[PDB]
Design a binder for these strands. Structure first.
Ligand SMILES: [Mg+2]
Ligand SMILES: [Mg+2]
Ligand SMILES: [Mg+2]
Ligand SMILES: [Mg+2]
Ligand SMILES: [Mg+2]
Ligand SMILES: [Mg+2]
Ligand SMILES: [Mg+2]
Ligand SMILES: [Mg+2]
Ligand SMILES: [Mg+2]
Ligand SMILES: [Mg+2]
Ligand SMILES: [Mg+2]
Ligand SMILES: [Mg+2]
Ligand SMILES: [Mg+2]
Ligand SMILES: [Mg+2]
Ligand SMILES: [Mg+2]
Ligand SMILES: [Mg+2]
Ligand SMILES: [Mg+2]
Ligand SMILES: [Zn+2]
Lengths: 140, 258, 134, 181
RNA sequence: GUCGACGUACUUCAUAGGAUCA
RNA sequence: GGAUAGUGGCCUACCAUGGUUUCAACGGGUAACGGGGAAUAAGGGUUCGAUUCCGGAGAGGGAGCCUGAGAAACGGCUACCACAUCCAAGGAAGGCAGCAGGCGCGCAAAUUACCCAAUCCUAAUUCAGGGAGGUAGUGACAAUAAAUAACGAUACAGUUGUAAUUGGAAUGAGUACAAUGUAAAUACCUUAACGAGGAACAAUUGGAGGGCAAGUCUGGUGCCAGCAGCCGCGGUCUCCAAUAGCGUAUAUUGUUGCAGUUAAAAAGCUCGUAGUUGAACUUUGGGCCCGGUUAACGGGGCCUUUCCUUCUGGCUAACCUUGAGCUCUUGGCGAACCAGGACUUUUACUUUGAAAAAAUUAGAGUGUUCAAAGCAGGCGUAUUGCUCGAAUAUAUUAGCAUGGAAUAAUAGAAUAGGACGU
C-alpha cells in the first residue's frame, strides 16, 4: 500500500536509515560525519539505526576497528533488536526492508546493493567520493 | 578625460541619496559649492525625493526661480546647489525650516526646527591662519572664512555662527567629555561623548566615543563634529538621538508600535 | 618526506615545479598552443561546405541500403574528398551532382551527414515545407 | 545606459530526470494537483530546496547566534504565514521536514477545489483562468497563487463573474435571446 | 620521388573467471 | 644652469662609474585594456570579464600645433603615408571605434522611425538645444506568469475503453463604440456589441515498435530466410519524453591530495653555490582580592628577589593635623592619574577596529492580481490628513591603529671601547 508503481509514498522526513557495517568504514575513511553527512545529503533530519547483527558484526572485527565501534555506540544512534539467530548482517538488513517499507539502507557492498535494488521502493544510500549519495529517493 | 566632468550616473551617485535605479540614466551632479560632492544633498533631491513637494525637476526649477528657498539665510536658485551638513533650509511660504542632519542610518533626514534655532548653525573649524595685513581668520567645514576670531579658537573646535551676520557668537573646544556627532564612515549619524583622543604624529588621529548606551567605537578625527557638552547639545537632535539599535531591537520596536 | 618541499617558505619551488609539469598534459598543451582543432573532423568548425561529386550507391539494388545513402563529397576548404550520409534514399533524390552541401558530424568509415543542400535544410525538403532553389 | 533589472530562474532540471521512481512521483503529483507540466513540479522543488538549504545553514550556526535567531525567526514566520508550517512546529528542524505536497496544497487551484467551489482540480483551474475566483475583492487568475491563512477564508466567486451575482455569460444570454426570438 | 627521421592526429590486437546443470 | 604650473637626467655643461639580476633582470609570446563582477565546485582550486559602474587609451597611421582654466582636441588646424569625392584640369573638399543605414561573397538578419513628456547636461538662460536619453517597431538573446477546454447524458466494444454522438453553462485569442494610458501614438489594465463542437479559432519537436499485397530484389538442404515494401490487376497504425518550446553538429597536475622493485618515472657516483630545512635551554610555580557568565568557563588586579628611567607641568586622592557637626573646615605633605620633552633591538605570527564606491551575491520588510521584479508603501476620510521604510552580512593580499607574548628569527658586556651614581 506504501508503493505507487516504483515510488514509495510512505518514506517521508524525518527518515529512518539502517547503518550497514561497511558504511562506517568509508564514513571514517572519507572523514564524513554520520549524522551531519546524512543531513547534508538529504537536507532532512535522519535517525540512524544499528541492528544487533551489525553491532555483533562490528565487535568481532577486532582492536583495529575500535573507532568504528565507538562511533556505533554514540547515544544519538538508536539500536534495533533482532529476533533471529543468524548473525549475518547482510541477510538481516535484507530481511527488515522486506517486512516494512520505511527504511533507507546505508551501505557500500556491491552485493547487498544489488539485492536491495531488486526490492521495490527501497532508497539505497552510499558513501562515495567526498560525501553521501542517495539513489532511489525522489524527494531530493 | 580632457577636463572636468559634468555628468553623474545614477549608479555612481552617493548611496545615501536613495535614488531609484530605474527612474533614469543620470543623477543630479551637485554644482561646486560649500560642501564636497559626496557629502552634499542637492536641493533637487531634497525638494523632490524627500519633501515630495515637486513631482519632477522642472517643478523644482519653478519653485527655485520663485525664490522661495533660502539656504543659510540666502536665496538660492540653482537646482543642484550642494546643500550639506548643518545647513538651514528655509521655506517661508510653507513657514517651515529644516536642518540637514544625518539620521542613524547614515542618510540626511527631514528634521524640522524652530525659527529661533534656524537663526544659527554650527561649523567645525577646519583651519585657523593669518591672512593679508595680519588679520586672523578661521575656515569652517562649509568654506566660511570668518575674520578676527577669538584667539582661543583652534582647529577641531566648533563655532556657533549667526546666519544674519555670519559672525561667531560662541565656540566649543575639543576635549574629553564633549558631545560629538559622527559625520563619516560606517558610524555615520551616531552621537556620543569623547573618551580619549589617540594622537599619532604624521598620521590620522583616532577618537574613542562612548554612546548613551555605553557602547564604544573608534573613529578618525576627520569624521567627528563637536555639538556641545554631554546632554546639552547646541542644536535639536533628530529622532532616536543618534543611538544605533541592533536589527533585533529595531524589529521588536517596530512590531511594538505597529 | 613525500618527495616534495613542505617548508613554510617553499611556495616558489611549489609554484615553479607545478608550472613546468602542467605541460606534460596533452589537454593543457593543446589548450595553450591552440592545436586542439587538428583532431577535429572539420579542422575547428562545427559544419563544413562541400561539393557533391557523385552518388556512389545510386545503383545498388537493395533499396534504402546503407550504401545507397552515401554521397561522395569534396570539401571546399581544402579540396579533400570525403563520404557523407543522407537520411534516406527519399532525400537522396534532392541531392544531385554539383550542389553545395553543408556537412555535419555523424558502413564504417563514414563520419559526416548532410544537413543542408543549396542553403536549404534537407529535413525541410523531406517534410515538403520548402523547395530547393537552383 | 539605464541600470540593469535583475532576473532569476525559478526552476532547475533535477540531477537525474530519468529515475523511474522519480517519473512515477511526478506523475502522481501532476495527476493529484492537476499540474500542466513537469516545470511546475521542478519550480516547487527548487523553492523547497532553497528553503531547506537555508534552514540547514542556519542550523549549522551555534544556538543564540544573532544571525541564526533573526533569520530563522523570519523564515519560520514566512512559512507559518503561507500555511506550509503549522503553528506548533515553529522550529528549524520541522522546516527541514517539509515536502513539496505541503506547498502544492496551498496553490489557489487546490484550495478552490477543496473549498467546494469546484468539482475537480481541473475544474478549479478552469474557473481560475476564466476569472471566476476572487480572493477578497481582487480577482486572481493565477493557479500558482499561494493562499495565505488569512486569505483562505475570503476565496469566493468574483462579483463580476456570472456565478457570483453578475449577469449571465455570453452563451446564456445568447441562448435566451434565440429562445425568445 | 608510392624517400628517411621527427612532430601531430587516428586505427587496430590482445577478457574472460568460478559454481551448477546437459 | 635651461625648461615646466611645478619636483625630477626632463634637457644642457662638467664630473665621477655607477644602476638591475637565479628572490628570474633583460629579451620573446599574448585570440593582454584593468577592476567591480560571471560560471563551476563540498572545500581547495580552474576558467571567463569587448559588453549597463569606475579608471585608462584612440578617433585610418606617424608628427606638430592655435585657442582656451582645461585639448597635443580630430563632428579644430598644418604636413607626410594609404585611400578617396567634385572639376570647365586652373583648383577645391575628406575622416561613422556617434545615431540610423551600406560595402567587405556569389549565400543574406533591427528603423535611413517619433520626441524632448521623464533622467540629467549646455547657454546670456524657468522658455532654446540635446540620435545623451526616452518611446515605439524589429530573428523565441537571457528571464516571469500562462490559454488550447470544464460539467453531464446517450451510444458501441471487451465496469474498463472509444466517439466528426449529444445537452446547456464558462471564457479569451481576435474584432471594436468608448474611456484610461501617452508629448502624440501603439500596447497593458478596464469595458458596451460580436467572437466555440471538427470548439477547422486545425501545438510542436524527437524517438521506439508494428501490420498489410496475385508487388519488387538477393540466397539456398523443397512451402523458407534476409533486404525491404508511397511502386499491386483496374482506377484519380500504436506507444514513449519535453511542451510554446524541441532537435542536431563542434567544444566542454595531487598544498589539502598522485606515482616511481616486479608495466609511465630515482640522475653512474661524489663534491658543491643559490633555494628549502635545521638539537635543547633563559619567569616556572605558589598565596590572596575584584567583578562576569552558564559547581565549570573565561577577564582583570596585587604579593611572592619581579614595578621602565628622568625632567617639567595640570589636577588631587589618601595621610597628618585645627575647628564645626562618617560629613564639612584650618594648615602642611602631596601618592595615583593625566599632558608634554628626553630615554628607546628589530620583525615574523595571531586577535580586535577603521578602510576596501554603487550595482552584483546572501538577506529583513512589502498581496507588483501570482511571480521574475521594484523600493515601494500603509491607515483613516463628511472635512482638513497622519505614518513605517529604503535594514544587515561578505570581501583576499598590501597600508593604518590595537591586545597578546606561545612558536620561529634578530641585537647585546670578551683586548670591556660595558652598566649605574647625590
Ligand atoms: Mg599630514
Ligand atoms: Mg616517516
Ligand atoms: Mg469579465
Ligand atoms: Mg649631459
Ligand atoms: Mg583578459
Ligand atoms: Mg589587444
Ligand atoms: Mg572589461
Ligand atoms: Mg584623446
Ligand atoms: Mg574605420
Ligand atoms: Mg589628433
Ligand atoms: Mg565622426
Ligand atoms: Mg569628440
Ligand atoms: Mg553606426
Ligand atoms: Mg548679461
Ligand atoms: Mg647552501
Ligand atoms: Mg629549535
Ligand atoms: Mg589587512
Ligand atoms: Zn538481525
Amino acid at each position: 500500500s506504501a508503493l505507487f508503481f516504483q515510488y514509495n509514498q510512505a518514506i517521508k522526513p524525518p527518515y529512518q536509515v539502517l547503518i550497514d557495517t561497511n558504511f562506517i568504514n568509508f564514513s571514517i575513511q572519507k572523514k564524513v560525519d554520520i549524522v551531519r553527512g546524512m543531513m547534508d545529503c538529504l537536507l532532512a533530519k535522519c535517525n540512524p539505526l544499528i541492528t544487533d547483527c551489525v553491532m555483533a558484526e562490528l565487535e568481532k572485527l577486532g582492536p583495529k576497528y575500535r573507532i568504528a565501534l565507538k562511533l556505533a555506540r554514540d547515544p544519538r544512534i538508536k539500536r534495533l533488536s533482532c529476533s533471529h539467530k543468524g548473525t549475518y548482517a547482510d541477510d538481516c538488513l535484507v530481511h527488515r526492508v522486506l517486512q516494512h517499507k520505511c527504511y533507507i539502507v546505508a551501505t557500500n557492498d556491491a552485493g547487498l546493493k544489488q539485492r536491495i535494488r531488486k526490492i521495490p521502493g527501497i532508497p539505497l544510500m552510499s558513501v562515495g567520493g567526498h560525501a553521501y549519495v542517495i539513489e532511489k529517493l525522489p524527494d531530493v | 578625460a580632457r577636463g572636468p566632468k559634468k555628468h553623474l550616473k545614477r549608479l555612481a551617485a552617493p548611496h545615501h541619496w536613495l535614488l531609484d535605479k530605474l527612474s533614469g540614466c543620470y543623477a543630479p551632479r551637485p554644482s561646486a559649492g560649500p560642501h564636497k560632492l559626496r557629502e552634499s544633498l542637492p536641493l533637487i533631491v531634497f525638494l523632490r525625493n524627500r519633501l515630495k513637494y515637486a513631482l519632477n525637476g522642472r517643478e523644482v526649477k519653478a519653485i527655485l526661480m520663485q525664490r522661495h528657498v533660502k539656504v543659510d539665510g540666502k536665496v538660492r536658485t540653482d537646482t543642484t546647489y550642494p546643500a550639506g551638513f548643518m545647513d538651514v533650509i528655509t521655506l517661508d511660504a510653507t513657514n517651515e525650516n529644516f536642518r540637514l542632519v544625518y539620521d542613524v542610518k547614515g542618510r540626511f533626514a527631514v528634521h524640522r526646527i524652530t525659527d529661533e534655532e534656524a537663526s544659527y548653525k554650527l561649523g567645525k573649524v577646519k583651519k585657523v591662519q593669518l591672512g593679508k595685513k595680519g588679520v586672523p581668520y578661521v575656515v569652517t567645514h562649509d568654506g566660511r572664512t570668518i575674520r578676527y576670531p577669538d584667539p582661543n579658537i583652534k582647529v577641531n573646535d566648533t563655532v556657533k555662527i549667526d546666519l544674519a551676520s555670519g559672525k561667531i557668537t560662541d565656540f566649543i573646544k575639543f576635549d574629553a567629555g564633549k558631545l560629538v556627532y559622527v559625520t563619516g564612515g560606517r558610524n555615520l549619524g551616531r552621537i556620543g561623548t569623547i573618551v580619549h583622543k589617540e594622537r599619532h604624529d604624521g598620521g590620522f588621529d583616532l577618537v574613542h566615543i562612548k554612546d548613551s548606551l555605553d557602547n564604544t567605537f573608534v573613529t578618525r578625527l576627520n569624521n567627528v563634529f563637536v555639538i556641545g557638552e554631554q546632554g546639552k547639545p547646541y542644536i535639536s537632535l533628530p529622532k532616536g538621538k543618534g543611538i544605533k539599535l541592533s536589527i533585533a531591537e529595531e524589529r521588536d520596536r517596530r512590531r511594538a508600535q505597529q | 618526506g613525500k618527495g616534495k618541499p613542505r617548508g613554510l617558505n617553499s611556495a616558489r619551488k611549489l609554484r615553479v615545479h607545478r608550472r613546468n609539469n602542467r605541460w606534460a598534459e596533452n589537454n593543457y598543451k593543446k589548450r595553450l598552443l591552440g592545436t586542439a582543432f587538428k583532431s577535429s573532423p572539420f579542422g575547428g568548425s562545427s559544419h563544413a561546405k562541400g561539393i557533391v561529386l557523385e552518388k556512389l550507391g545510386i545503383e545498388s539494388k537493395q533499396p534504402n541500403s546503407a550504401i545507397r545513402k552515401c554521397v561522395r563529397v569534396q570539401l571546399i576548404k581544402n579540396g579533400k574528398k570525403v563520404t557523407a550520409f543522407v537520411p534516406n534514399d527519399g532525400c537522396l533524390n534532392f541531392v544531385d551532382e554539383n550542389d553545395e552541401v553543408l556537412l555535419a558530424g555523424f558502413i564504417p568509415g563514414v563520419r559526416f551527414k548532410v544537413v543542408k543542400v543549396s542553403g536549404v535544410s534537407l529535413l525541410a525538403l523531406w517534410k515538403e515545407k520548402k523547395e530547393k532553389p537552383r | 545606459p539605464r541600470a540593469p533589472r535583475t532576473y532569476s530562474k525559478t526552476y532547475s532540471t533535477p540531477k537525474r530526470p530519468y529515475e523511474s521512481s522519480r517519473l512515477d512521483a511526478e506523475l502522481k503529483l501532476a495527476g493529484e494537483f492537476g499540474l500542466k507540466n513537469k516545470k511546475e513540479i521542478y519550480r516547487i522543488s527548487f523553492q523547497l530546496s532553497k528553503i531547506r538549504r537555508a534552514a540547514r545553514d542556519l542550523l549549522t550556526r551555534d544556538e543564540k547566534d544573532p544571525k541564526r535567531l533573526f533569520e530563522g525567526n523570519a523564515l519560520i514566520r514566512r512559512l507559518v504565514r503561507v500555511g506550509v508550517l503549522s503553528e506548533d512546529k515553529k522550529k528549524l528542524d520541522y522546516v527541514l521536514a517539509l515536502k513539496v505536497e505541503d506547498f502544492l496544497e496551498r496553490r489557489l487551484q487546490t484550495q478552490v477545489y477543496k473549498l467546494g467551489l469546484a468539482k475537480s482540480v481541473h475544474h478549479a483551474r478552469v474557473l481560475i483562468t476564466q476569472r471566476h475566483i476572487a480572493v477578497g475583492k481582487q480577482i486572481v487568475n493565477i493557479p500558482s497563487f499561494m493562499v495565505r491563512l488569512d486569505s483562505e477564508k475570503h476565496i469566493d466567486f468574483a462579483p463580476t463573474s456570472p456565478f457570483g451575482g453578475a449577469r449571465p455569460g455570453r452563451v446564456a444570454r445568447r441562448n435566451a435571446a434565440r429562445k425568445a426570438e
